[PDB]
Design a protein around this ligand. Sequence first.
Ligand SMILES: [Fe+3]
Ligand SMILES: [Zn+2]
Ligand SMILES: [Zn+2]
Ligand SMILES: [Zn+2]
Ligand SMILES: [Zn+2]
Lengths: 172, 172, 172, 172
Amino acid sequence: PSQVRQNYHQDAEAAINRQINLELYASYVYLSMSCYFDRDDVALKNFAKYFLHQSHEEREHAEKLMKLQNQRGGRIFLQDIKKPDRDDWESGLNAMECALHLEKSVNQSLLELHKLATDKNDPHLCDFIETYYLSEQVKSIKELGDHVTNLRKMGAPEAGMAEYLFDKHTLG
Amino acid sequence: PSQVRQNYHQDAEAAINRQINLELYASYVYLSMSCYFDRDDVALKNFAKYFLHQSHEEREHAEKLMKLQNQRGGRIFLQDIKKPDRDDWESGLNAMECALHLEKSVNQSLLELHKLATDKNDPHLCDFIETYYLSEQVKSIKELGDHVTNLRKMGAPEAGMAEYLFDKHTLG
Amino acid sequence: PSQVRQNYHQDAEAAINRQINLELYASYVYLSMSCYFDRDDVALKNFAKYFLHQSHEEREHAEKLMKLQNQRGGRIFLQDIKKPDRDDWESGLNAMECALHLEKSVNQSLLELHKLATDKNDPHLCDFIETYYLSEQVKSIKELGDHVTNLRKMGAPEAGMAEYLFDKHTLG
Amino acid sequence: PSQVRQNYHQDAEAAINRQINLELYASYVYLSMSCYFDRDDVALKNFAKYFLHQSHEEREHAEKLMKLQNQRGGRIFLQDIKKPDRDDWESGLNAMECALHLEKSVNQSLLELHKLATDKNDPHLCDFIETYYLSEQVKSIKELGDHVTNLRKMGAPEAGMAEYLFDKHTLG
Ligand SMILES: [Fe+3]
Ligand SMILES: [Zn+2]
Ligand SMILES: [Zn+2]
Ligand SMILES: [Zn+2]
Ligand SMILES: [Zn+2]
């Protein structure tokens, strides 16, 4: 074993590697969304900015898990980052709904990771997940839900001014 | 009697205790409204902020009446703060209309208190009510009426963009 | 269910609503204590200030739980805020002892909430309680115990100068 | 009549002259108290300072009434300022109790003046009394009551350290 390794189960190590991949995947999905809003036939700059920010944040989440893996004496094993499910995200509202779904899926994975850490009596890992991941996920999910609610109420995407004005007022 | 008490009728003391309860109740109603607008399926942050501010102001109004009670040598007797009449405030417009109704009810109570103070020849209490309560109430009522008027004209709540844009432009 | 809701048991939602009420109740108790010390026949300004501060802090605790409820997709249901058990708090020492009792009761409720969150495998809620509530409660309880100890040792309330000097030196 | 006089009853003019004398008398009483605490066999400097401040404030109250008299076109008629009832004020507590009595007597006179102004339909005079006199009196009375309460509780004057420590902590 690594000279630093202590109370770090092989199953936790494997789950952290899976979580790294999932965060990198989420980063890629958000990058895809960002570049959709930069298309000349979509042209919502603040939607593009919002999703690019989310992409960079997910990369940071992945890098922090890589740091944790090494700190605990685990070994990072990278896998392919799969392409996102869509090229065309159809609308600001649809992208926000897809983002909400993604964030909930990431949250579910983190909750499973916390359950594993609890089962293996790894309080450092539990604390790490709680401190750096779980509260962030809840905040992100609430924000996306709020955005979805507002866009729906405004009449997006059928009401032509809705996404435009949301881009200016909420995301600007 | 309290060593400080002078020209302070028992009926005024009792009416001040009732007014304290009413201000605390109003504070609670506004708190309820504020947290409705923070729901993920409502998500109007500036409505939430507006009503939270009103909640805190009503608490301050109650505390100032408690200070008056002690200053005059009366004794504060607290009562239960009843829960607001609604959990779900339905819309920004409806909340503003309910707030207007509440503020007018508080104003009516203050006018009755001023009448009592006048009848008991208590000019200090009359002046206190006039100086710190009556002008504030008139200002609040006018503001809420203005908000109701604008929301109605904009087409709230049926017009989906109305509350959103009012939240941004008037309450932002 | 709310679009944001994930891993949030109905029993936790209900327990959070109960905790909101308890924090609002504690706020009201402290407000009662504060206004007792402002009486002309008590006249301990720093006791009054201390308890008013505690009242405002408890309100903030309640508001933070309301924010949590909405963040997790629960629904706030408010109840009556019952009046405190006493109008007359008798002495600085007695008020501090009653405050200690209250803070321990709030702590017990929070520990029961944490146990529920643990049983329902809700690490976000566990973390929230730990991070924002449990350490604060322990600190508050220790502080009140220290105050009680000092007031008792000084001879309060029989020793007339004790509460006066404690008001100046400890609470001033 | 004076070219400026309007809605200013001769009875109000006379009552203002009486009030001027009473404020000057109160100023003199407080001056007497102040110089008692400066005696080498009393030697409570902050009691002396407190009462000297009150003396100067009462003079200002008198001067403001003189200004009002002239503003309304009344004519100031001064009378003798009677000496205070005591040369020796016996103790800090006794002086505070005598001050409380004096302030309540001044307040009673002001309430009678307000009643007269009300009866003569002189809203400017009513407002003047309310704005500049009544709230000040209530504040002064509450403060003196608080001081009396604290001195009594501390054991003044029999408890030798009470007035000394009150002089340092409350009046210092
Ligand atoms: Fe001392
Ligand atoms: Zn992430
Ligand atoms: Zn109010
Ligand atoms: Zn609390
Ligand atoms: Zn005066």
